[PDB]
């Protein structure tokens, strides 16, 4: 609720990576706070620019210990900036550059925590991340129920054969396999919606869907480039029943790390002497699943 402190944290690319972290804080009193702490954690693989920290340490009403100042690329994963006061009338702002010294996929949000020394309970915390909307992990919420969405965007991508498709679509937890057409894409801030017409139920699961019924598939905006789903195109999709969202008979589908999403070339793109194989593999796959079903 941040009753005693205003805290805005911002991360932006600077003019390896380097970006600018800006921290803006104000005390909610009729008087200035006295000695207060900025407790800062890094996004994983980032470290403060030391020159930028020296500038800040020389700033009035601020202290950064020699301790912090001759840490390193080594392990300034965390930093404390000591403030001699914080203004109550306007924001006391500061910024510094952060450099990526180790690069990884999946960087955890950093966090900034303000409090006055005398009272650790009356604190404020903000998170930050280069793509996450104010530092927030991805999760899907319905009323007071959330579920985490911090996983791979969908299944994998060395050849894709009929055989692997058949094995994978027949794994014990796979609940539905569809041929779909993308009717409508709805983009938003947090989660994209893809309204698929279900053109055939190759495998039917716990969602009773008639032929040509639309279902809505959901994906985190961070998955948007990797899916590159396009309207009017066809897809082979399958997934687990663990990925349903909502209640019958109005289920949605979460696209997650156990969802197969494959582009199914169009009827007249299948002639191209470079779609032929994939198109026959889809056709044999369908015939096998429609007739034999799954071998266990």
């Amino acid at each position: 609720t941040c009753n005693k402190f205003d805290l805005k944290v911002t991360i932006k690319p600077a003019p390896k990576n380097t970006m600018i972290l800006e921290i803006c804080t104000r005390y909610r009193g009729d008087q200035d706070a006295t000695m207060s702490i900025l407790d800062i954690s890094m996004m994983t693989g980032f470290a403060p620019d030391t020159d930028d920290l020296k500038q800040l340490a020389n700033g009035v009403d601020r202290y950064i210990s020699k301790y912090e100042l001759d840490k390193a690329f080594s392990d300034r994963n965390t930093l404390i900036i000591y403030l001699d006061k914080v203004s109550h009338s306007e924001d006391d702002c500061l910024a510094f550059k952060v450099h990526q010294y180790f690069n990884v996929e999946l960087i955890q949000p950093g966090a900034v925590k303000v409090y006055a020394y005398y009272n650790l309970e009356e604190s404020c915390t903000r998170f930050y991340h280069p793509e996450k909307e104010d530092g927030k992990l991805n999760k899907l919420c319905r009323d007071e129920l959330c579920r985490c969405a911090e996983e791979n965007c969908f299944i994998q991508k060395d050849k894709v054969t009929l055989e692997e498709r058949l094995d994978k679509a027949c794994e014990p937890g796979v609940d539905y396999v569809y041929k779909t057409r993308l009717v409508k894409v709805q983009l938003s801030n947090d989660f994209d919606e893809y309204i698929m017409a279900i053109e055939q139920t190759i495998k039917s699961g716990s969602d009773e869907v008639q032929v040509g019924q639309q279902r809505t598939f959901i994906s985190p905006i961070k998955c948007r480039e990797a899916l590159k789903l396009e309207e009017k195109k066809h897809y082979l999709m399958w997934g687990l029943s663990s990925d349903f969202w909502g209640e019958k008979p109005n289920l949605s589908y979460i696209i997650g790390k156990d969802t197969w999403v494959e582009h199914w070339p169009e009827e007249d793109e299948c002639q191209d002497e470079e779609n032929q194989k994939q198109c026959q593999d889809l056709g044999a796959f369908t015939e096998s699943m429609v007739v034999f079903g799954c071998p266990n």
Binding site: S41, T44, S74, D75, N77, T78, L106, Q108, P109, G110, A111, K113, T125, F127, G135, K136, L137, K139, C141, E144, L145, C146, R147, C148, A149, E150, E151, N152, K257
Partner: protein
């Protein structure tokens, strides 16, 4: 990895009571010069700390005697301090810290530290994907490791992190609970 205890082979510490040994015993061992001696085998808990043991006797001859407190320090040269808050709110993101301590006098440690997946929490750990950092801790120092998590269910829920060092037979794990409270 090459040359490090596997996550599944680490048994996390879990017994962290604030008090224990609330016990009553009569001193009836065959006495010498009026004094009976009792030996008690106790199992120290999992806390790295100093326990204060207080005894009080009651005797129909000597009345009541509060003894001088007895201290026992329980330690280790490498360990995690998992600093969890008392309670957290359902669906609110928090940062907790795992603090890694190296109290070896002149040996610095290359350490792999991991936050375990738990479906009661949203974090960067999944069932199929580990959330593991490799860090170096210098002699006689500590490293604060931050984790961002979101509690997804109320009641008593548990956070667990573990660490092992490369090239040595050193590891640790801490498994602790916190109260998750509704919005």
């Amino acid at each position: 990895d090459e040359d490090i205890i596997a996550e599944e082979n680490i048994v996390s510490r879990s017994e962290f009571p604030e008090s224990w040994l609330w016990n009553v015993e009569d001193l009836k061992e065959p006495p010498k010069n009026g004094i009976s001696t009792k030996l008690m085998n106790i199992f120290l808990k999992d806390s790295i700390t100093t326990w204060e043991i207080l005894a009080v006797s009651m005797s129909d001859k000597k009345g009541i005697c509060v003894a001088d407190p007895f201290e026992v320090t329980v330690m280790q040269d490498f360990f995690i301090d998992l600093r969890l808050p008392y309670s957290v709110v359902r669906n609110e993101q928090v940062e907790i810290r795992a603090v890694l301590y190296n109290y070896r006098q002149n040996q610095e440690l290359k350490v792999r530290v991991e936050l375990l997946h738990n479906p009661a929490f949203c974090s960067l750990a999944t069932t199929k994907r580990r959330h593991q950092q490799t860090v170096t801790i210098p002699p006689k120092s500590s490293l604060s490791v931050p984790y961002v998590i979101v509690p997804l269910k109320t009641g008593l829920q548990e956070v667990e992190v573990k660490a092992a060092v490369y090239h040595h037979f050193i590891s640790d794990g801490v498994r602790k609970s916190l109260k998750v409270v509704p919005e």
